[PDB]
Amino acid sequence: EVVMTQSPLSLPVSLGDQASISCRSSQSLVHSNGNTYLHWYLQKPGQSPKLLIYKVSNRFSGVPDRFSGSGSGTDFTLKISRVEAEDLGVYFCSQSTHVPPLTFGAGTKLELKRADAAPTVSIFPPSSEQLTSGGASVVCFLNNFYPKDINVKWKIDGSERQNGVLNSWTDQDSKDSTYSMSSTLTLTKDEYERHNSYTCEATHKTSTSPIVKSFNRNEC
Amino acid sequence: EVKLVESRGGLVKPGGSLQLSCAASGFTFSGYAMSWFRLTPEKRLEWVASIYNGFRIHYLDSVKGRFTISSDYARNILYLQMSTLRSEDTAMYYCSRGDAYSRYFDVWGAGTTVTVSAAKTTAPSVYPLAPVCGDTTGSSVTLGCLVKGYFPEPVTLTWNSGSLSSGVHTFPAVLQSDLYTLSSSVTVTSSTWPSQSITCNVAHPASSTKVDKKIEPR
């Protein structure tokens, strides 16, 4: 069972820049026969994986010379001399020296850099239609922000709430390179009618203080 | 071209069974390591099984005794018989051709989805998300749509039948009580709504349902 560790998990770059992805194995990948079966694959959204480099440094047929691989033993590196738009996606390293099973690293997402952007936060109360069914979802959108790291906190009558929260994140926007997130706090109609103040708090590098959006139920 | 034509996937209840297959096109299986891989919901790539010239067989431990890989070298068709299916087996499966000598996989079939669940076909409930009291007088206003409790994936969501495309963010579905929930927001100039109508259109093929929800004030 060879564990493969890739660093970093996310690599923001500007088109034209050089990029380097690292991969480390829990054991040396040098086989008894002298070969090192370490490979690099790329998988784009909605597509199947594509082989880029095999046995550490052999570029597969058809792959651009901008891709090169190096390393030995337990540490390897995939380099892209000049990043192009078509190179954006997830890069996976994989070992087939100790098999079975053949194993893969968790992947590294090559993404685009852009100027920082604070999220535009909007909060929404449960709809009258949902309440009629006995449910009450409070929704919060945290839109068009950068970088992608962000934290969301829900508060009911001023106290932190953790149960019932479900989050969803979009992939980087192809037009403006920002990220967006949707957070939904689902309660029963009973619980919703039991409290009045509902708050969505966002913590993002663009602010020393959490960004806050809130509303009171008895007002609507 | 050289390729692998993948079979259609399927929906299966836990404990059930299903068979996948891939046909070679432009090449022959002999000499290659034919294998099955899968991309889990968490987005992790996993090797599942391999077979070489019909006499060398390997399996990921978690599928031994449940999955069976076989090959018809005459017709050049790879199979994956999945039995005693579990929720954890839900994923996008790929068949692939690998070099026996260098141990890499260069030819991959298109992904085939296998969903293991006890859920029954369910139409989604589409809820309008109207701005709270006080957030309707800025330069722009954001409206939303909550699509809750449907199965199976996917649904098609548009705003104003598709004419409203900019400033829209539709989020990936998440599981909630074994059913899917998705949301979408649209941001427009403050003077646009509600003088001009904004409608969330949700289509769910599986249930032949089309729901249009107008977003209205208060």
Question: Residue B104: which of A51, A100, A220 has the nearest Cβ?
Answer: A51
Put simply, the chain A residues between 72 and 101 with a CB less than 8 A from any chain B CB are 90, 92, 94, 96, 99-101
In chain A, where are the structural domains located? 1-114, 116-215
Beta-carbon separation of A51 and B183 below 8 A: no
The distance in angstroms from the start CA to the end CA of chain A is: 56
Look up residue A215 and give its two tokens. 């509303």
Distance from CA of A158 to the nearest CA of B (A): 18
In chain B, the residue whose alpha carbon lies closest to the alpha carbon of A131 is B127
Query: What is the CB neighbour count within 10 angstroms for residue A34?
Result: 6
In chain A, the residue whose alpha carbon lies closest to the alpha carbon of B144 is A124
What's A116-215's CATH class?
Answer: mainly beta
Distance from CA of B73 to the nearest CA of A (A): 23
Look up residue B214 and give its two tokens. 């107008």
Measured CA to CA, the distance from residue A52 to residue A91 in angstroms comes to: 9
In chain B, where are the structural domains located? 1-118, 119-217
Distance from CA of A68 to the nearest CA of B (A): 16
Look up residue B77 and give its two tokens. 């068709």
Distance from CA of A80 to the nearest CA of B (A): 20
From residue A127, give the alpha-carbon distance in Å to each of A29, A135, A199, B125: 57, 9, 17, 11
In chain A, the residue whose alpha carbon lies closest to the alpha carbon of B146 is A139
Residues of chain B with Cβ-Cβ distance to A106 below 8 Å are 44
Q: Which CATH superfamily is domain B119-217 in?
A: Immunoglobulins (2.60.40.10)
Question: Residue A219: which of B99, B130, B133 has the nearest Cβ?
Answer: B133
- Specify the experimental method: X-ray
Same fold, B1-118 and B119-217: yes
Look up residue B143 and give its two tokens. 């409206």
Measured CA to CA, the distance from residue A107 to residue A80 in angstroms comes to: 16
Q: Which CATH superfamily is domain B1-118 in?
A: Immunoglobulins (2.60.40.10)
Measured CA to CA, the distance from residue A32 to residue A38 in angstroms comes to: 14
Fold of A1-114: Immunoglobulin-like (2.60.40)
Resolution, expressed in angstroms to one decimal: 1.9
Which segments of chain B are extended strands (E)? 3-6, 10-12, 18-25, 32-39, 45-52, 56-59, 67-72, 77-82, 91-99, 105-108, 112-116, 125-129, 140-150, 156-159, 168-170, 174-176, 179-189, 199-204, 209-214
DSSP reduced 3-state for B206: helix
Phi, psi of A191 (to 5 degrees): -65, -40
In chain B, the residue whose alpha carbon lies closest to the alpha carbon of A47 is B110
DSSP reduced 3-state for A1: coil
Query: What is the CB neighbour count within 10 angstroms for residue B125?
Result: 19
Distance from CA of B43 to the nearest CA of A (A): 8
Measured CA to CA, the distance from residue B169 to residue A183 in angstroms comes to: 13
> Measured on CA atoms in the order A187, A193, A195, A196, is the torsion positive or negative?
positive
In chain A, the residue whose alpha carbon lies closest to the alpha carbon of B105 is A51
Residue recorded with tokens 């037009």: A175
Residues of chain A with Cβ-Cβ distance to B103 below 8 Å are 37, 39, 54, 96, 99, 102
Q: In this structure, are residues A51 and A37 in contact, taking their beta carbons and an 8 Å threshold?
A: no
Residues of chain A with Cβ-Cβ distance to B128 below 8 Å are 127, 129
Distance from CA of B176 to the nearest CA of A (A): 8
Q: In this structure, are residues B112 and B8 in contact, taking their beta carbons and an 8 Å threshold?
A: yes
Q: For A127-135, which contacts have Cβ atoms below 8 Å and span 24 or more sequence positions?
A: A127/B127, A127/B128, A127/B129, A127/B130, A127/B146, A129/B125, A129/B127, A129/B128, A130/B125, A130/B127, A130/B146, A130/B148, A131/A189, A131/A192, A133/B125, A134/A188, A134/A189, A134/A190, A135/A186, A135/A187, A135/A188, A135/A189, A135/B148
Contacts of B10 (CB under 8 A, 6+ apart): B18, B114, B115
Beta-carbon separation of B127 and A130 below 8 A: yes
Question: Residue A102: which of B47, B173, B176 has the nearest Cβ?
Answer: B47
Residues of chain B with Cβ-Cβ distance to A220 below 8 Å are 132-133, 218
Same fold, A1-114 and A116-215: yes
Q: In this structure, are residues B200 and B145 in contact, taking their beta carbons and an 8 Å threshold?
A: yes
